[PDB]
Paper text:
Bacterial hybrid malic enzymes ([name] grouping, multidomain) catalyse the transformation of malate to pyruvate, and are a major contributor to cellular reducing power and carbon flux. Distinct from other malic enzyme subtypes, the hybrid enzymes are regulated by acetyl-CoA, a molecular indicator of the metabolic state of the cell. The larger ME isoforms (hybrid enzymes) are predicted to be a fusion of two unrelated enzymes; a catalytic N-terminal ME subunit and a C-terminal phosphotransacetylase ([name]) domain. The [name] domain is homologous to [name] enzymes (that interconvert acetyl-CoA and phosphate to CoA and acetyl phosphate), yet they appear to lack critical catalytic residues and thus acts as a sensor instead.
Author numbering:
A (entry chain E), B (entry chain F): 439 to 776
C (entry chain A), E (entry chain D), F (entry chain C): 441 to 776
D (entry chain B): 440 to 776
Write the structure that this text describes.
């Protein structure tokens, strides 16, 4: 139940040791959020990250005392408009977005907000990653990240969750960003999810989900059939199939008995959804009524390490999410050193 | 999870004993379907129904003997084109659909098909219910039912599934029929699911699911917020709320902590979905990877007793589905004693 | 005139290779008008008919109708035929990513229309004729799903209007609700080829409610259809957009639109939508004083034709003669 | 030809009840060869008094080149020099001043024979008009619709008669509406029915489709609904649809295959789903059937005005003018009621 | 002249009301042009200004600009104001079914634009003026979300063109991209009532690129807007569709369109889309010889105006004078 | 002054061509304001006017107006012109697949607007000026159908605002309801070349209600129009999306958007739709205190301009002076 998460913690430790013992600097814009602070007590004990809290230092240190969490007494607290880099950060956002309606006045007002300040910190290398969204809706938390840090080349911003089963994990995407991805977008989501599965030493086997089995009819069935064709043309080395129903996808015996002509054998471990209603409802329902741990969402497709929590998260969910944000920050920091 | 199903079995028996010992006559158009026949061995042993098989008697009896299946030697096997009521049934389908493109030629050709013949048997009272779809896709199996038996007044054809948890069940709909139901259709689906929950002695508490919490924004959030408003005016005695995410819906602690203004307290036990992708994927994923039994889909909104299996069903799934079809057939047969 | 030469043309083909008559399967084994027509067709050695149905029910109808020549016609019940499960597997193989698994294939192959289409596809018959008792959409769907269209073809119905110096070809009278400019050009090329098979020069008009207006909508569409077809067959006279009397009357064309590329009157009329084609051929047939034969299904890989359900017995006879000709043509193409 | 001779006799019969005066029919195409040749017959048969529009010199020159003596004293009116010209300009302006027609536009339009003819009819200086022999239908019909307009709940629609051996068939709308709605197809049907009743015949109406009683999305559903709407407005008539064209006209096909239908004995009024189907059908029947087809006749408009098909023969013009004369006489009676 | 009369009504209003001046909050406490304008406005007893920001950095800007009269001005930092958490709760109460929970409400209320809107909404200020340093959309959204539109109202920007003998009103210059006919009628009525407050008879033109054409698109929309508005205020001259020179020039209208119901020239011009209204007032402002004041936000429940970010120091002075007038009018309405 | 310099260049062009004056045909031979304008224009040796109409009714209007220099003006009645039937054949030749047969061609060619257009097309006149009496759409349609656009040209109206230090050019003020980004760039290039003919460097702003936002709709379209135009004339300053005051005021541009490629103020303003351009130039003309001349039709193969029907007499004089300049320029390009 816990095995995949403690293997992640152990990989964070191996990465820290291979780099002087340094921990990733993870900035939290919600410096007074009760669940973030309670989670950070566990995370600092486990040497997962060096946290940076954003807010008015007096009020963050007020909240830490009311919650009685001494292990954070040293933790750095930064008030955005008083940080020495504020004016350079204002200038950078203006430079990036002056033809997207951000003049100096808009940049100045946005950079005062902790979410924008956290995103620019990560973009500029003043932090290695960020974790936000514990106290506000996903759209408002993710917009600063997409506008500031942006997507890498050909990337698509997309949320991913792991369902931690007994044999294996299953990856679900896109659980957070795209309302109704096109066939081309679902293929790119599949490739992004696939390289994450490969990072963990697993063979990705991809199903494009629908309410139909290999019907190819207009609408969602046709879209997910074409998504699988596009993804296969970009990664012909992977098993990728669709359109198919969700039990057809995960159960190898159903697949073999009913659709043995299919190219997907042994059950899918990457499930790509046709719309945001389906992915968002599915991972949340599994999390609540299944008997498996679900971790995420993790934001993929973006140039730097940045993750948005689901606002319904528990304290333990934040701990799990920061562990994988630390792993992502370490990976990206090593890419930026080659 | 065996308790909710064994209680249904005992209610089928109590209904039979309260009516002369009659068992409900359930017709199965797929007379040679391996899983249907294996299921019927258990269903006859458990005195759930009088099964009627459709097909060529020697091909059906050959399959029963090749599978070594007892208790089916007395079972009625009917070939549609040789049944005495065939031409009357042709006459009736023409009468019903002559301005929908069904002349006598079309009616004769359709009525030779077991799925069409089974539906007319139920419509005309020659059977008390039917169960189909073990060997063909849902759209093709459900179309004869909707075209022949049709919806009751203001009903909407809609599939419903039960998730049987340890302390409660959850109802999911519409898992099979409507691709993208309107706000008005999602209210009617909720009302149909609510009356099913009440038949089992439980108070229904209804959530209109979205990827959003009380955002009411254009698109799905607005549709599901409005669907809850319509349903509240139609059943002002019930807790009905939306738009909300799936974990907000089922977890009473999340709702109270984050949205205490909501009218839904104590957790939803009826989940109404915004489109068929989300509902169909969700119940199949829960069934495969959750550790709870999922029964259904059950076709609601139709004038007579008729259910379509998921073609991915197991034999035990068919046994479970027929138990509840028997209950529906007994209930409708007793309403028709007015 | 035109029909008797076609009948002789079937006999000419039979003698030339094998001596065998084309095997034509009729899925509607109990259809009264089909059975009455087959009395004439067997007497004239047009085809070896294969009827689909329950043998005893088909034999009751033949006896009840008192038709003597059908005493030993072959009658086949789909589910009992030795090739039934082979046909089921083939349909699954063809359509498994179009929603047809083995369960769907078994259910469909028990239906005579599907079984007839597969018999022809597999070479167990040389052609089929259906649609005497059901609507065209339901009769043609199994053919298109099983046999399919040839490379770059478009399924399209074609009718012949038989005047005294002339025949006119009308298309597409049955399939496409609202064909695009590209589709109307392809329909034109398919019709032009049938006309050439009968030794006639095809002269094609893309019909509209307009004369060379080129305005948005149907006029622009039919103007472009003629341009596309001209680029694909630069050797033919093809013109549009033009009205129907402009198209067929060489005098109106010369007097009012001498700049047009179509002179001497069109004998191939391509229609802009299915309302116009379907109503027009049926009205000419009923109230005109010319015989109309067809519709004939063009663009498909094997020989298969769907009757209009309003057909007379004599209309079935005419349709089967040309189905036999198509079957012989395709069957001889399929050796080389 | 029986049906045409009976119409000719009713024009004379109507003339006898009013002093012997003939309807004044204006022809804007004063130099059109086929119009002039047709008028020689029409003046001979006392169908109408024609009024030609143009330059008197060019019109009388053309009459002389074709050697048609019976037209050497027909009235010729040049729009811009006629005494009512400035009055006509003011009227078109008064009618269309919030439809983009000012005094400048009205002066320019009224100088054109088609507009001048339409206004002559609108103002009672003529009893009817016939145009469209030399220009496309759209340009000929637009001045009529803009000047005279539709009567209340009316719809502009062209109608043709197929004169069979023992009935006529009415086809509509063969000229105006590209793609009428179900509601418009109902109104076209009612307009055609009242014309059929004028000739002493019972109207039996079919809404044509490529389908028989399918009711499927698109044209089948539209023509099924057109029949329902029209039936509610004239519950005394047989009106049915959707149905195919041979189903509609052949009583034996209808009785054999669709005995539940409300249309028995065959339709004599065929209402078409779009302009492609109606325009092609009447032209093809006219060219290749062996029945006479007369029209199109413009229905739904407040005064008598018809537009010929530009492909017309001289005898077609003669046939069309006879029924325009009848229409002109009918409207002149109502305008005294 | 029109401006001295507005100032002078603010003064009469302040008189007879204890000497009280309207409390106007400016969220942009460090904005150079806002501070420079306030030197003139407090000097002239127009308003008691409240500046939002970090007090220490606002006084820093005031000293750099050498404005000694602003030393005693009230400066409020949103997050430390005693009512801050009360304001958070109010926004949550208003917008909890529009996606604003306590977390969102608390984050938004820390922003000066949101804090100013709530101050006005709760009666802690009598009006607000924003938008000198950020785009109009970002400045107006908090006002629309917090204060909202009154019943049947439409949010719409309005400008006055102050000519020598008269003023012209233009709307909607800021809010609606492409108003419907119904919205353009409601905009006309809102502007008409403002003109009546200044003692003038409103004469309304619905502007288009066409004169009385009524053709599909913009001509039909503006013809219909005038018909709708005429039915709601039949006592007023309201006409359209018409071009802009037809609208303002009584001689052109009389010479070319004497049938029109608009005589004596329009003084209210309602535009068909935001491109036309926004470009028009700015171009007249830059190259004409007339003063243009505004835009003024109409249709909202309390006094709140958004500057054009291109404003001069005089523009801000002009705008605040009329915001003060609006604030005083509203405060009396809320006194019954 | 700008107009007086134009008149002098007409004379300088005339002197260099043997003293010949351009032949300008006016289809509105009886239009009061045209006739009064021609009194000034013939006195100023601007053009040789040709009036269309009935020679008797035209001379009847001239004498009643008392215009002595018009005594020997050429007056042409289209149906009586010796080239009439040649012109009918030419219009038929051009448009026979656009719905114009010989009958339509005869009827249209009898209309002065069509006849005036064909005279210019065939070289029987050097230019035409119409639209004093009728709406712009009806006046411009014959020109576009007969003369047409030069290759890749776009028909577009242009107006000059004659300011004190400079002029501003506005387009497209008359033709395109809602030009695409690609069309807006082409309008910019045409306007740029006219400004260069007057010896001035064009600086182009793509106008919007937004400043450099690039948001969907008009902002994105005008940002993209500027990008396309820059790639076609990399030597010019061309920028967008921007508001109208940002565009014309160099101090606003430098203070608020110094990253912009446009410095020193735009003198060419390209509008996003016809509502904005048409209302703007008419409002500036009526309530600004600067003269506005035009509209002038650009993008067409020959010299032809449509007046605004609301024009004054002095406006027609101004318009004809520049039509004369265009006619003279075009005649030496056609001597290649």
């Amino acid at each position: 139940s816990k095995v995949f998460i403690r293997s992640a913690i152990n990989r964070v430790h191996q990465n820290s040791a291979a780099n002087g013992g340094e921990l990733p600097r993870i900035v939290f814009p919600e410096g007074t959020s009760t669940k973030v602070l309670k989670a950070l007590a566990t995370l600092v004990e486990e040497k997962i990250c060096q946290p940076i809290l954003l807010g008015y230092p007096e009020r963050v240190k007020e909240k830490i005392k009311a919650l009685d969490i001494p292990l954070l007494n040293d933790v750095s607290i930064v008030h955005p408009s008083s940080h020495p880099k504020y004016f350079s950060f204002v200038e950078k956002l203006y430079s990036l977005r002056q033809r997207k309606g951000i003049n100096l006045g808009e940049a100045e007002r946005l950079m005062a907000d902790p979410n924008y300040f956290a995103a620019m910190m990560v973009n500029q290398g003043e932090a290695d990653g960020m974790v936000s969204g514990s106290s506000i809706n996903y759209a408002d938390a993710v917009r600063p990240i997409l506008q500031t840090i942006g997507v890498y080349k050909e990337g698509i911003p997309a949320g991913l969750n792991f369902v931690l089963l007994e044999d294996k994990f299953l990856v679900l995407a896109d659980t957070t960003v795209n309302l109704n991805p096109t066939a081309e977008q679902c293929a790119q989501i599949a490739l992004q999810a696939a390289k994450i599965v490969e990072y963990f030493g697993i063979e990705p086997r991809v199903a494009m989900l629908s309410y139909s089995n290999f019907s190819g009819a207009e609408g969602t069935p046709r879209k997910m059939k074409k998504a699988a064709e596009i993804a296969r043309s970009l990664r012909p080395d992977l098993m990728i199939e669709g359109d198919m129903q969700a039990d057809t996808a995960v159960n190898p015996e159903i697949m073999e008995r009913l659709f043995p002509f299919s190219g997907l054998k042994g059950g899918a471990n990457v499930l790509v959804f046709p719309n945001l209603e389906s992915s968002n409802i599915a991972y949340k329902l599994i999390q609540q009524i299944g008997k498996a741990e679900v971790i995420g969402p993790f934001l993929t497709g973006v140039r730097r390490s940045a993750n948005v929590l689901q606002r319904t998260t528990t304290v333990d969910g934040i701990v799990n999410s920061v562990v994988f944000t630390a792993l992502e920050a370490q990976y990206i920091k090593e890419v930026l050193k080659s």
